[PDB]
């Protein structure tokens, strides 16, 4: 509590960042209530599959962090709550461990305390087009033993970044189709906060993707950190990033472009998934698990009991969503009836989502 | 700043004038977030044609002021800012210096300090039911060397003053239609905050105008200027201004009508565009260039720094949302894709605006 | 200024009853901006037909009051400035006239200050519930020499009343259609705030009417008035009339109603009629007359003078909106090009109102 | 209705400048009310002297305006208001009639309208800083017949003005102690928004000044109308004037810092004055007549019948505080009970006001 | 604008720090004006002493920042501009380039460009109670030949520091009363926010102090910028130091402390002074000069022509304040009439300020 932590950590944990000026559209789904279940509480069935492994809720921690050894401590709370629970967590990007390897204890130390769980590594896609590729990946993974690495999409935050260009040339796309042939796990593309499109997955899936995480807006805004990170050097672009705030596909809208558009994919919801009704909402809509990073960091910040505290908040909100629904398990929460309103309806209209088709393939 | 400015002038740099209880409906427009690019910042092509001239941004200032000479100094920066960004320039109403030889100096400035963008010439489309035709605009052209024409349409402007009356009957059109046969240069019909529709911009069509520019309401609100002109008079006219402040077309429904209506048109979308993201939807919604005129006034008033960084702000802005819809070029970000809600797709479903061949037009 | 007020002139003019809680659902409606409208301000012609005569501007003051001295006073101000401006005015109901002579004289200086305009007599639909035949509506008529008598409905303001019991059963229209073929001037059945639905214009029409005045809900909001008469008197109904602040049909959605369900109707838009743009827009959605009551008495209670500057306005603001829409003439508004949204969208989806048949009937 | 109006005038009468961030202070007075008041409603005699005229209320218009043709149709509505009222009036700065013969007309008007009341003349004191003399006092008095010349103090305003710099050197005052010996009518020196302190009264009384004008703060604030003309110049004086807008003696703590200072002075209580109990208030706290400018303009522009009434309002306010005061007479209310609470109270307090021998001088 | 700047001038200039929760009970000083004052604004004569320099304004800019370059750049800005209007300039803390010969440079600066005006080096408190003596000092003043060196007080900013713990032990004192003894140029002792009271200036008088800067509550919130440091670390003192937010002298209350304590002192009226009419006051009341860091700081950022701008205002700000007091010159406005009123009224009462000699000594 002495020493300032990395600037965009200090930003997201402690300044007003947290859904500002933008809107996950959950709030249009409602998940119909059953008042006669069919099923007890007690007998209601968590458990799901992510990829080899079974985990015992459908959520996970998606990256933050890692790097120096405040971030290493975070990282350890998080990966010791998370076996606890028997829920996967990502790493932060890697790319710091990749370059010195003073950093890779606050990496390595997720897999030393989590033995069992799925543990995923992390590497922004523009680093695919300087020079990182297959051995780099490949690092990534064995630093922490990992059972998938998810590459990051982050153009908003670089474009308002004080220094600099996001580069998202084609090219990266046809290092990672290579890459893919080459790993003993799988890819997870990841958003940033401002969600997967229709296009961008139906792009990814292209190149061979087919897991892909929402990271929609009305979560954490990165593009409002890097405005903060503007208005803390005078910089103008600050009053650019203003006017983007409400930028990007809101998560319920990209769980339903991701599910349409690759109805076979393996889908996580996440971006501003902040109670396990959100959650419950996010796998019901067409995700097969629900992701969140904010609040995490939030309550490891505030220590081992908190997260414990907030994993159990989360998991009982979750249950009661899935027993007041009649969802005996996480298959029938993912085909249980719902109505969608308001402006997810109109932005699911005008991007040819037909509705009975949408129903279907969400199951 | 010791001696009064024109009054319209004084009231929309300083009063509350701009979007007074009016609406560009560019708030139900969404360019949908591309989380992979595919393209690299640097690599974004904003150059774009403006008749037989190619300009280096797809946005003009639209016509304000001359006439006097603290109304030149005002063209002299704005038009040398704007020839440092090759970005065209239209001056206003050129009717003074017709009748005047002193006030030509005012317009003719901006030639001088600007000899190679677009500039754009401008008369009142009541002049010519009042005497003004074909040697007065080969005049005007003259004066400043134009590239083009624009032919104002303010009737709302015109019912709400102190004093006076709108003529807009049909010979000017059939004035209008002869000249356009004499000129050296095209016509750009444009309004001034109260937008064009379907109906005019066939009407216009039909007399063989090309060439629109929106000047829909949510910008300078006009009836709002003549409303505060009538209140300092004491003349009852101002409260029945005030039933009219949301009087006009949207300039983001104007967008679609005209390009609907006119699918061949050339058309520029103004009216209340206040950043590089307005100018973005403007341009994914149908137009082929954005239009600004009250924020560079107030900027170019502060003085030509303040003018400069307007504009690098506004062209950041617009490369900023090409960038995040994987646009590289002005073409590419005409065809991105949007979502339209809320009511700008109510009014485009009473006009009879058929989304499919909408977007099919619009591209 | 000494002598109290009857208690509903007193409640209407000085507390807040007017669109209280209610709404003529007129935001919903716009008339389309004209940028070239086609004609010039001093070629625009108000004047319609009202039965067997012209009036000067389609708008009428329709029936509030008479039958004391101070009562009859209003009224001769009213017509006065009705006469000079060749505008029809109806009078107040004329129940207390046909019951006692001394009660006449404040309906009969109507006439004599208003020799030439169209004067509408009133009686309500309750008289002939109760009694009242051809002689009473025929001395109704002969007390001012009547162009047209009105029939009032008021049944919601009857069940709220402290003392209330509204019938209103079918023998009084068959007295009615018995009724119209003895008399030699036409009979318009109005509403008295609470709307006209097409159900009730088509048992209407069954009956031989076919002139009706809307006076929906939205203006003033008898609901209110006799709510604060309960008030006044410590009666509970009040607390019941709160809750039903909000019945009846808007305004806007009777206008449309009675034009589709009576296509042949003469048809008076009215109920929260407050500027000539409500006029216009009444009268562009299907009316052929925009007709006033709250805002002339208000008016007329400050005098002559502030009368006729408001009658002044509305002209002017009817004009400033046939001017912007381009309509030349009265027939032209009611063709112009309008969009209906929200609301008032729904409620027409809901009722059966196909719009194209609506656009084709309404013109 | 068409021209524009002279610019001070336009703002006073149309901006939001009465009061503006500042205050009387008389919210700080309360006359206590006397339940036996001793008289009846219609012996209240509200007669008084203006030096050798009887006058019928002890209330007077300050000077505002003259010098155009419709600042002296205003000039001529007061004036014949005025006499019919029998209430003293002065005119605005005669300066302009001075300089140019045009401009005698719109101030001679007063006295062919009103030959009786007592009509007061007009200088600044900045004309005697540049060399008007005794000559021009004469002519600004034959002009009018003037009873009496008031000079005006405005260094506040004149310091904000675009163009501005105030020069009040003592030899003005020795001119003015000159000059008085000369003229056949009394001088009285008046403030113009901002106050007299006991200091300026001292010094004005030492140069044989006896009658004066408070014009303290909390009426027409002159330097937000400054501030107002500096923003609509885009000059920078406007942020400074700002920071002033409660600069200034207000009007209640003039009154008395101008009783005490100089108990034997003809006072006149104005600056804010806006009812009949504010006339009352400023009387019982030490003035001879209370003086009111901005409402008497703005209910002159609406025209004669609104300023009668304005009249009959504010006498019948005075005459109330008159009857339930007991005070059967102006000089009954000069020694009525009142309560000084508040900032008053404390102003008076740190500036040697002892109350006691306060409550003696005033009576 | 791409690089962070040291954490407390980024907090500093961008977060809302100024005055939080905080008040200076400037607002409870009254500068009484004089509608006759008697000067003309030309003569007003700003000028006063600084030690043997005479400077334009008695206005300085105290000690911020130096020590990076980024840091010396806006140090140039300010004393360039310091000099070109005459007003001396206190540099930051010098502590950095007394351990560091790398960050001389950035201090050093300011005599480079500022070669006339007094400059005022800077050292705090706690360097004497740590280890620095009398070459420290003299180091301090010859790296920028300075004309004096303030020792800055800031124990409430420590306290509430992340790492913090102020010492302040008296023979910090004595070690500054020695080093008096062999300095070439006066010390003047100030505070950092919180004030200085009558028990502390009579301490540091008593070793041999006679010059003091308020530097009070009400401006620069250091408890406020130290909360922000703790909240960005998760550090719980941020809830501490919210509870001291208005821990401190206000400036006006320090101002007549210092003076009444203190009253052959020379004496910067300092925290919270944001106009020239701030300025004004804190003279009246008793200060020789006013002094500013934040708002100086603040349009050096923006740059050299916003601080010419600023400098301009305040300047005028103080002449006019000068000129509505009559006041000629500085001597004039220290004896300017004044009311004392509110909090700051009660302060001095409870803190045995006896008004009367409080007059005299102020004078
Ligand atoms: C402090 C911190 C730091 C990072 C992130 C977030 C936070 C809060 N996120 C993005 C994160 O995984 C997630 O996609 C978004 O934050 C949206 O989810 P929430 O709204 O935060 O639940 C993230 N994403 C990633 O792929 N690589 C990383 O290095 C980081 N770093
Ligand atoms: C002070 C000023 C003066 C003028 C205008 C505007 C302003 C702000 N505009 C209309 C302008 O070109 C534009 O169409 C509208 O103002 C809408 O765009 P903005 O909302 O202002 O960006 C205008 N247009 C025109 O064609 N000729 C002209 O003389 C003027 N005068
Ligand atoms: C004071 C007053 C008195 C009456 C009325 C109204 C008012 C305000 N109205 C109803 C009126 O004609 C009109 O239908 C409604 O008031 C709605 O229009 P406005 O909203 O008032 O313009 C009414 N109507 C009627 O047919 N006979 C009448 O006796 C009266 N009395
Ligand atoms: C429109 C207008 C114009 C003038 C003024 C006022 C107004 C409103 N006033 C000042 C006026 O006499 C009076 O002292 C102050 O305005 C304060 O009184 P009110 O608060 O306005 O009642 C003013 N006084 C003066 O002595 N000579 C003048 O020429 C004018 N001009
Ligand atoms: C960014 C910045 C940094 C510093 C300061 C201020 C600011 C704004 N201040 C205190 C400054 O001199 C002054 O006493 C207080 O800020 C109160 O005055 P203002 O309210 O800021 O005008 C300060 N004082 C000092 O003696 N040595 C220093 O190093 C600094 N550093």
Request: aromatic residues 8%; positive net charge.
């Given at each position: ?9 200090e ?9 500002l000026?933008?809107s996950?559209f ?15 509480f ?11 492994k079974?985990?015992?809720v ?34 932060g ?26 543990i ?7 680093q695919?087009v ?8 490949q690092d ?15 153009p908003?935050?670089?474009v308002?970044?004080?220094?600099g ?6 090219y990266?796309?046809e ?8 790993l ?13 499109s229709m296009e961008?997955?139906?792009?990814l ?30 910089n ?27 109805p ?6 996440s ?9 419950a ?27 414990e ?8 909100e ?38 009975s ?7």
């Open positions: 509590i002495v020493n300032r932590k990395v600037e965009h950590v930003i997201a944990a402690f300044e007003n960042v947290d859904g000026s933008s996950t959950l709030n249009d789904v409602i998940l119909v209530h059953q008042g006669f279940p069919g099923i007890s007690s007998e209601i069935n968590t458990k799901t599959k992510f990829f080899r079974e985990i015992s459908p959520v996970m921690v998606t990256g933050m962090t890692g790097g120096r050894n405040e971030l290493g401590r975070i990282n350890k709370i998080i990966a010791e709550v998370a076996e606890k629970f028997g829920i996967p967590m990502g790493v990007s890697q790319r710091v461990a990749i370059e010195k390897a003073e950093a890779r204890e606050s990496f390595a130390i997720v897999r030393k305390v989590a033995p069992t769980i799925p995923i590594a992390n590497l922004g896609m523009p695919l300087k020079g990182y590729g297959l051995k780099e990946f990534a993974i064995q630093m922490i033993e990992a059972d998938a690495i998810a590459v990051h999409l982050n908003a935050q670089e308002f970044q004080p220094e260009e996001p580069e998202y040339q084609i990266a796309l290092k990672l189709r290579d890459i893919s042939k080459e003993s796990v799988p890819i997870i593309v990841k958003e940033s906060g401002n969600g997967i961008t997955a139906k792009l899936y292209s190149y061979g993707i087919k897991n892909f995480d929402t990271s929609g807006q009305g979560g954490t805004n990165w593009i409002a950190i890097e405005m903060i990170r503007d208005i803390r050097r005078g103008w672009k600050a009053e650019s990033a203003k006017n983007f705030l409400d930028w990007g596909v809101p998560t319920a809208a990209s769980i339903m472009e991701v599910r349409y558009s690759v076979d994919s393996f889908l996580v919801g971006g501003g998934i902040r109670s396990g009704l959100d959650a909402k996010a796998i019901a809509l067409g995700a097969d698990i629900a992701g969140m990073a904010l609040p995490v960091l939030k309550s490891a910040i505030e220590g081992k009991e908190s997260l505290q907030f994993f159990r908040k989360i998991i009982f979750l249950k009661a969503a899935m027993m007041l629904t009649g969802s005996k398990d996480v298959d029938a929460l993912k085909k249980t009836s719902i109505v969608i309103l308001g402006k997810l309806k109109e932005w699911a209209e005008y991007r040819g989502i037909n509705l088709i949408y129903e279907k393939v969400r199951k």
